[PDB]
Amino acid sequence: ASALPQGNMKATATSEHPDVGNEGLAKFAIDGKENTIWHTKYNPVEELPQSITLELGGSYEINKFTYLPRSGAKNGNITKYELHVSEDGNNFRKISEGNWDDSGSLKTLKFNSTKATHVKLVALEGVGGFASAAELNVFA
């Protein structure tokens, strides 16, 4: 499986902090820059759950998803998640769920090959009551 080029993707989120330098637009989750993050809105706080959706630029049989947390600081490190896919951009189905430790470690989801044009990462819980992501990648 190979990471799909992020430049063919479009990221949208249910909440994003505006650009205050290196956070927190959704698009910052797929820019190839480890120092830039998506972060949920927090002037003032928009409470979880919140999600980020990646439009993949095509139809792919995907089988792996990686979540790279922000480096150093911990706010928004996602600790309870669901991963959903859509073949159409409209209807989403849950394909993975669980808990993640709050470290900055890469979190990797491996699942049975599934057709998707979109992937959605739902943050149910995250450090500080926020969600953030330095880099999201999707593999086919």
Residues binding Ca ion (CB under 5 A)? 28, 31, 33, 36, 134-135
The closest alpha carbon to 136, from 99, 75, 83, belongs to: 83
60 binds, among Ca ion, Na ion, none (CB under 5 to 8 A by kind): none
For the segment 73-132, give every residue that binds Na ion (CB under 5 A). 89
Q: Which does 125 bind (CB under 5 to 8 A by kind): Na ion, Ca ion, none?
A: none
Check residue 15 and report its DSSP letter: S
Distance between CA 100 and CA 98 in Å, rounded?
7
The amino acid occupying position 34 is: E
Q: Based on the number of CB atoms within 10 Å of its own CB, is 39 exposed (0-12), middle (13-18) or buried (19 or more)?
A: buried
Binding partner of residue 89 among Ca ion, Na ion, none, CB cut-off 5 to 8 Å per kind: Na ion
Tell me which residues in 32-61 interact with Na ion (CB under 5 A): 55
Residue whose CB is less far from Na ion, 13 or 69: 13
Cα 133 → chain centroid: 6
Least gap, CB of 115 to Ca ion (angstroms): 27
Chain residues binding Na ion by CB under 5 A are: 55, 89
